[PDB]
C-alpha cells in the first residue's frame, strides 16, 4: 500500500512522443532511400 | 500535427491544493461584523 | 463580455514550431530527393 507521485511537467512524455514521431518517419524514409539506392 | 494546450495541474489546482488560503480566510472572518452585526447604529440612553 | 483565460504552460507552441520547422525541412529535402530519383 504506497501512493504514487505525480510530476507536474508532462513535456517530456511529449518530447518523447514528438522524437518518436519524426524519427520513425525519417527512419521509414531513410531506410527506403537506402534499399533504393542498392537496388 | 497539431500539439494541444497541455498540463498535469493547472494554476487553480495548485492553488486549491492547500488547505488554508490567508486571504480567503481573512475575507470571510472581517465580514462578521457586517454581517452578524449592526456596526452603524449608535445606542444612547 | 467574458475574460480570456490563458494556459501556463507555452511548451506546446514551442514543440509546434519545432515539430513545423523540422518537418518542413524534411518534406522539403526528400521531395527534392524524390524528384531527383525520378529524372
Known amino acids: 500500500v ?3 507521485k505525480t510530476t507536474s511537467s508532462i513535456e517530456f512524455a ?3 512522443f514528438t522524437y518518436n514521431h519524426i524519427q520513425r518517419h525519417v527512419n ?3 531506410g527506403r532511400i ?3 539506392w542498392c537496388e | 500535427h497539431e500539439f494541444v494546450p ?3 495541474y493547472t494554476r487553480h489546482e495548485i492553488k486549491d491544493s492547500g488547505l488554508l488560503d490567508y486571504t480567503e480566510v481573512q475575507r470571510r472572518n ?4 457586517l454581517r452578524f452585526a449592526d456596526i452603524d447604529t449608535v445606542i444612547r440612553a
Chains 1, 3 share one sequence.
Open chain 1, 2 to 4: 504506497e501512493r504514487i
Open chain 1, 14 to 16: 511529449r518530447l518523447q
Open chain 1, 28 to 30: 521509414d524514409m531513410l
Open chain 1, 34 to 36: 537506402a534499399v533504393a
Open chain 2, 6 to 8: 497541455l498540463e498535469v
Open chain 2, 30 to 33: 472581517q465580514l462578521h461584523d
